[PDB]
Amino acid sequence: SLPKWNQPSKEGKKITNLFVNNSLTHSKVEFIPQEGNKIKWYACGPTVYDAAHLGHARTYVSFDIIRRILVNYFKYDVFMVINITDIDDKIIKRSVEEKIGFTELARKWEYEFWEDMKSLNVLLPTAITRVSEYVGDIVKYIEKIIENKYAYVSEEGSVYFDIDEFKKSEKHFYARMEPLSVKKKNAYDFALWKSSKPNEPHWDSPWGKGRPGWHIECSTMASNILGDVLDIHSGGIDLRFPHHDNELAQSEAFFDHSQWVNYFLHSGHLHIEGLKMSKSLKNFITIKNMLTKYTSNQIRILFLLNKWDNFMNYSPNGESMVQCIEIDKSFTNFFAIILMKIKNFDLNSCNLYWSDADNKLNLLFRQTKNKIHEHFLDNFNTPDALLAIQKLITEINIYMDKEKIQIGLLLEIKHYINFIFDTFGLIY
C-alpha cells in the first residue's frame, strides 16, 4: 500500500555521488541521470497577473543556484523548462477589474517577471512554455488519457481524471508524495478540462468550449518538451500536493508507465513574520521594491544562507539583510585587495621562494576546495559552502597583509573564488 521508487541504473551515467532530498522517497538519495550526464528538468513557473515578490525570488533564485551548481560546478548537461501560467482564474478576475484583456495582462506581468529574474541574475530556462500557446497540445493530451480509460467526460462538457480507475492498476499509485492528503464519480476526481462559461476566455475541444485544468497544463508542456521521463521536476513545497501529485498521475496515465519523474525537488517557501509571503495576506515585498533597498548580490546571499529545501523566515526592516550586507561587504573588500595586489605585483623585484607561509595558505586552499565539494554533494548545502569561503578569505586577507606574496597562488585563489561566486550567482 506504499508507493515504490526505482533508482536509475548507474551504468553508463555520470556519477558524482551527489545526494538530493527527493520528495518521492522523502529522503536524501543519490542522484543518477536517466541518460549519460544529462538532466531533463521542469520547474513550475509563476501565474502572471501581478508583480513578482520576494517569495517568488526565493523559489527561482534557489533553483537558479541549484542549476548553476549542476552545470557550472558538476558539469551536468541541463535541459531546463519553466512554464508561464498565463491562463488562470486569477488572471481572468484581475483582467475584468482592470478592464484589460486577459492576454494583455498576462504578457505584461510575464515581462516584468523575467525582468525581475534577470535583475536577480537568474538564468532563463532552455524553453519557456506558456499555457496559452499549448492549448492544442493539452487537448490532445487529454484525448489520450481518455483513450487509456483514466478520464471521463461529464454531461456539461468537462473532463475529469478518474482516481479510482487509476489506483486500480498495479502499475499506478495516486498521490505518491502525499498519500495521506487525499457529475464526478468521486469527489477527489479533478478536472482536466473545465467547461467554460460563455463570458470566460475559452478554447474549442471535442468536449465543448472550455479551459484547461491547472494540473494538466504542466503535464502537457513538460511531456511535450522533455518526454516520458524527467530527471528533475521542481516547485515550491506547497505545490507537492495536489498539483504535483496530480501531474504524476496524469503523465503516468498518458504514457501508461509507473515513474514520470525520478527526482522531485521542493523548495521551502519564504515566510515573513511566520506567514508565507502572499498577495492575499498583504505582507509582500515586490522584487523591484527590494532592489531599491538592496543589491542583487545581497538578496542572493540571503537565499544562499538558507538551505533551499528548508522553510525560511524573513525579518523585514533590514533585520535579515544585516548579515547579507556584512558578507557582501567582506567579499567586495577581499576582491578589492586581491585584484589590486595581482595588478600591481612586480615580477622584476620580487622574491618567489615558496615559504612556509605560502605552503600553509596553499594547504588551507586545497582543503577548502574539498570541503565545498562535500557541501555541494550534501544536497546543495550552500550555507556551509558560503561559510567555508568566508573562513578562507579571512586567512587570505591576513596573508596578503603580512606575508611575501606568491603572485601565482593569489591568482589561482582568485580564480577559484570567482568560480564559486559564478556558481552562487554573485557578481563582483
Measure the CA–CA gap between 186 and 420, rounded to whole angstroms: 52
304 binds Zn ion (CB under 5 A): no
The residue whose grid cell reads 470566460 is 200
Q: Which stretch binds a second copy (CB under 8 A): 20-28, 126-134, 299-307, 327-335?
A: 126-134
Among residues 110, 165, 231, 247, the one that binds a second copy under rule CB under 8 A? 110
- Which positions ≥6 away from 214 have C-beta within 8 Å? 85, 88, 243
CA distances from 259 to 229, 250, 252, 398, 417 (A): 7, 11, 7, 53, 39
The packing angle between helices 382-402 and 321-344, to 10°, is: 40
> 264, 224, 226: which is closest to 38 by C-alpha?
226
From Na ion, a second copy, Zn ion, none, interface partner of 238 (C-beta below 5 to 8 A by class): Na ion
Q: Judged by CB under 8 A, does residue 111 bind a second copy?
A: yes
Taking CB under 5 A as the criterion, which residues in 171-190 touch Na ion? 172
Residues 341-380 that bind a second copy (CB under 8 A): 347-349, 351-354, 358, 362, 366, 369-370
Residue 44: which of Zn ion, a second copy, Na ion, none does it interact with, CB under 5 to 8 A by kind? Answer: Zn ion
> Minimum Å distance from CB 182 to a second copy?
33
Binding residues among 213-232 for a second copy as defined by CB under 8 A: 224-225
> Do 382 and 308 contact (CB within 8 A), yes or no?
yes
State yes or no: residue 133 binds a second copy (CB under 8 A).
Answer: yes
- Written as one string, the DSSP assignment of 340-364 is HHHHH--TTT------HHHHHHHHH
- Give the alpha-carbon dihedral of 266, 272, 274, 276, to 10 degrees: -40
Selected binder of Zn ion within 24, 32, 44, 82 (CB under 5 A): 44
Window 232-251: contact mask with Zn ion (x via CB under 5 A): --------------------
Report how far residue 400's alpha carbon sits from residue 145's, in angstroms, rounded to the nearest whole number.
Answer: 66
Among candidate residues 5, 42, 44, the one with its CA nearest the CA of residue 26: 5
- Interface with a second copy, residue 326, by CB under 8 A: no
Using only C-alpha atoms, what is the Rg of the chain?
A: 25
Interface stretch with a second copy, choices 104-112, 198-206, 261-269, 391-399 (CB under 8 A): 104-112
- Contacted by 79, from Na ion, Zn ion, a second copy, none: CB < 5 to 8 Å by type: a second copy
Residues engaged in binding a second copy (CB under 8 A): 36, 38, 73-75, 77, 79-80, 107-108, 110-111, 114, 123-130, 133-134, 224-225, 347-349, 351-354, 358, 362, 366, 369-370, 406-409, 411-412, 415
